[PDB]
Scaffold this active site. Structure first.
Site, PDB file in Angstrom:
ATOM      1  N   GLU A 171       0.790  -1.240   0.000  1.00 18.33           N
ATOM      2  CA  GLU A 171       0.000   0.000   0.000  1.00 18.33           C
ATOM      3  C   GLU A 171       0.821   1.288   0.000  1.00 18.33           C
ATOM      4  O   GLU A 171       0.742   2.069   0.950  1.00 18.33           O
ATOM      5  CB  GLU A 171      -0.937   0.023   1.217  1.00 18.33           C
ATOM      6  CG  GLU A 171      -1.866  -1.176   1.300  1.00 18.33           C
ATOM      7  CD  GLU A 171      -2.983  -1.017   2.329  1.00 18.33           C
ATOM      8  OE1 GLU A 171      -2.991  -0.012   3.087  1.00 18.33           O
ATOM      9  OE2 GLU A 171      -3.864  -1.904   2.365  1.00 18.33           O
ATOM     10  N   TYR A 313     -11.108  -3.786   0.447  1.00 18.12           N
ATOM     11  CA  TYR A 313     -11.960  -3.747   1.621  1.00 18.12           C
ATOM     12  C   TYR A 313     -13.366  -3.256   1.308  1.00 18.12           C
ATOM     13  O   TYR A 313     -14.341  -3.898   1.671  1.00 18.12           O
ATOM     14  CB  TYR A 313     -11.339  -2.869   2.702  1.00 18.12           C
ATOM     15  CG  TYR A 313     -10.135  -3.512   3.337  1.00 18.12           C
ATOM     16  CD1 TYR A 313     -10.276  -4.350   4.438  1.00 18.12           C
ATOM     17  CD2 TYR A 313      -8.863  -3.316   2.817  1.00 18.12           C
ATOM     18  CE1 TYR A 313      -9.180  -4.962   5.022  1.00 18.12           C
ATOM     19  CE2 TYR A 313      -7.749  -3.926   3.399  1.00 18.12           C
ATOM     20  CZ  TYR A 313      -7.919  -4.744   4.498  1.00 18.12           C
ATOM     21  OH  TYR A 313      -6.830  -5.357   5.084  1.00 18.12           O
ATOM     22  N   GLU A 438      -3.721  -2.062  14.643  1.00 17.63           N
ATOM     23  CA  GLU A 438      -4.255  -1.534  13.395  1.00 17.63           C
ATOM     24  C   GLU A 438      -3.888  -0.061  13.206  1.00 17.63           C
ATOM     25  O   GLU A 438      -4.766   0.789  13.065  1.00 17.63           O
ATOM     26  CB  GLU A 438      -5.769  -1.738  13.348  1.00 17.63           C
ATOM     27  CG  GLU A 438      -6.171  -3.207  13.301  1.00 17.63           C
ATOM     28  CD  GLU A 438      -5.981  -3.826  11.917  1.00 17.63           C
ATOM     29  OE1 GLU A 438      -5.755  -3.058  10.953  1.00 17.63           O
ATOM     30  OE2 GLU A 438      -6.071  -5.073  11.791  1.00 17.63           O
ATOM     31  N   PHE A 447      -9.478  -7.293  13.335  1.00 11.90           N
ATOM     32  CA  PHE A 447      -9.602  -7.839  11.982  1.00 11.90           C
ATOM     33  C   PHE A 447      -9.276  -9.334  11.865  1.00 11.90           C
ATOM     34  O   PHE A 447      -9.457  -9.918  10.798  1.00 11.90           O
ATOM     35  CB  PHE A 447      -8.691  -7.069  11.019  1.00 11.90           C
ATOM     36  CG  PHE A 447      -9.296  -5.803  10.487  1.00 11.90           C
ATOM     37  CD1 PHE A 447      -9.310  -4.652  11.252  1.00 11.90           C
ATOM     38  CD2 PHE A 447      -9.841  -5.767   9.210  1.00 11.90           C
ATOM     39  CE1 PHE A 447      -9.882  -3.481  10.759  1.00 11.90           C
ATOM     40  CE2 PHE A 447     -10.405  -4.605   8.711  1.00 11.90           C
ATOM     41  CZ  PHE A 447     -10.422  -3.464   9.485  1.00 11.90           C
TER      42      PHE A 447
END
Ligand code: NAG
Length: 475
Positions: A171, A313, A438, A447
């Site tokens: 990312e 997501y 997170e 998660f």
């Protein structure tokens, strides 16, 4: 029942992790500091509850037991990242290699392989050594490329005999946007008018950083291809995240806005990787704040992946945002678009425990077909897909997660549809293996398909989703 036989033979099912989010041992084992050590300790107000990854899941010490849980679930693969400052405590190769750090990753890899689990290794998952951030501003500087390359080469040299799937970085959108536009992620930079970061420039630095991220990636890929791939016979790619963008209305204005939003988040990276050039909308709207690739750089970046990792997501509605005479200059406002999960007040899908995140499984196939059609049918891995629960129920209730079972059933059905539409997907990884740190949300969002009881000695409990995955995998 829905099971793995519906997917191509040899499809890789796995779970995902990353070093800062899982390892802990932040100051142990010879490890040097990274920008996330620094960020969490110097800006506690920017992390939910003022949490850090000092300990996280203590995966550094608990890896043997965690690898047993992976085998129990019956996973084919495991995504994990190398902590740059753990293996090179001063960032630069000349600063010395930390043998104890190398030893840790060898230990994890050897254990994984003994359980028949393929390591998918991310080289850079945002935890830049502080030494490099301090020396030249990290990815603000062209100097980052050759230090990144040496780091990648260390990984190839020490682990590539056993690791056959490399991801250069995870990312880069998040790193650039979060770290340099909004100042929500390390190193925490943004424009002074935001009164939120001590330093930065939201209108220039995201573009500078993204350029250097792409060049660093490309240098690592070149090296792998020319010096290691023929002998080690692995594959190298990069992981990108994007939201799927849906026009808020049928208007041309909103249709165009939705595509601009996708251009600025996704196209920013995939168009250089596919075409050696930035999206036309970014060239047009950002102008000379957007760096240009030289002829040599374009050739280096174009085609620089064996496979594309996609993190999926959510989807968002997108609204057109008219120009103004009021210049809050930033990457965010450059796209003239506004994302919202709500149309006429109603959410785009089922709620999750995460306020901005709704279930839109159609968008996974939509994204995959778009990618196939625009970027020449690449080989794809879904390197992250998952949902978060809020951390405010008991362990016993947290383990019961039918909503995540639902989530995975629906998205894997959507994935199956995408494959039947000819998308060359080769694997799928759940974010996350464990409930973890997170980033800016600290430990407030869970998660994992495996529960971690942070209040009771970090004990692991497989959730119903993990047991569902185990059944799905015929294991
Ligand atoms: C798995 O799915 C296949 C359909 O492709 C089915 O034939 C098989 O019986 C299933 N196995 C189970 C549910 O154990």
């Amino acid at each position: 029942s829905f099971n793995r036989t519906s997917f191509p033979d040899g499809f890789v099912f796995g779970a995902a992790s990353s070093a800062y989010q899982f390892e802990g041992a932040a100051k142990e084992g010879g490890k040097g500091p990274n920008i996330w050590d620094t960020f969490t300790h110097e800006f506690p107000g920017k992390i939910s509850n003022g949490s850090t990854g000092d300990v996280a899941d203590d995966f550094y010490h608990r890896y043997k037991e965690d690898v047993k849980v992976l085998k129990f679930i019956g996973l084919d693969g495991f995504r994990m990242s190398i902590s740059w400052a753990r293996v090179l405590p001063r960032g630069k190769l000349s600063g010395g290699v930390n043998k104890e750090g190398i030893a840790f990753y060898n230990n994890v890899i050897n254990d994984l392989l003994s359980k028949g689990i393929q390591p998918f290794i991310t080289i850079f998952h945002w935890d830049l050594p502080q030494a490099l951030e301090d020396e030249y501003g990290g990815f603000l500087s062209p100097h980052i490329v050759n230090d990144f390359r040496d780091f990648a080469e260390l990984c190839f040299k020490e682990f590539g005999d056993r690791v056959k799937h490399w991801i250069t970085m995870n990312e880069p959108w998040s790193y650039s946007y979060g770290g340099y536009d909004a100042g929500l992620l390390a190193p925490g930079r943004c424009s002074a008018f935001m009164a939120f970061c001590p330093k930065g420039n939201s209108g220039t630095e995201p573009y500078i950083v993204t350029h250097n991220l792409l060049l660093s990636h490309a240098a690592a890929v070149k090296l792998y291809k020319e010096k290691y791939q023929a002998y080690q016979k692995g594959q190298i790619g990069i992981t990108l995240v994007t939201y799927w963008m849906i026009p808020y209305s049928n208007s041309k204005a909103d249709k165009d806005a939705a595509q601009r939003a996708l251009d600025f988040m996704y196209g920013w990276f995939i168009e250089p990787l596919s075409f050696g050039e930035y999206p036309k909308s970014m060239r047009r709207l950002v102008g000379k704040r957007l760096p240009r690739f030289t002829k040599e750089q374009a050739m280096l970046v174009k085609g620089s992946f064996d496979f594309l990792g996609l993190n999926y997501y959510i989807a968002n509605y997108v609204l057109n945002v008219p120009t103004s005479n009021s210049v809050n200059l930033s990457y965010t406002t450059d796209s003239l678009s506004n994302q919202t999960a709500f149309r006429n007040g109603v959410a785009i899908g089922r709620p999750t425990g995460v306020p901005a995140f709704f279930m839109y499984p159609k968008g996974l196939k939509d994204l995959l077909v778009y990618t196939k059609e625009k970027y020449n049918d690449p080989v794809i891995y879904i390197t992250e897909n998952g949902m978060g629960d809020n951390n405010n129920v008991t362990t016993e209730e947290g383990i019961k997660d039918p909503q995540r079972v639902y989530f995975y059933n629906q998205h894997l059905l959507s994935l199956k549809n995408a494959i039947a539409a000819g998308v060359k997907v080769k694997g799928y990884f759940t974010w996350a293996f464990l409930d973890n740190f997170e980033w800016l949300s600290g430990y407030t969002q869970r998660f994992g398909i495996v529960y971690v009881d942070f209040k009771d000695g970090l004990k692991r409990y497989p959730k119903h989703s993990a047991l569902w995955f185990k059944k799905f995998l015929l294991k």
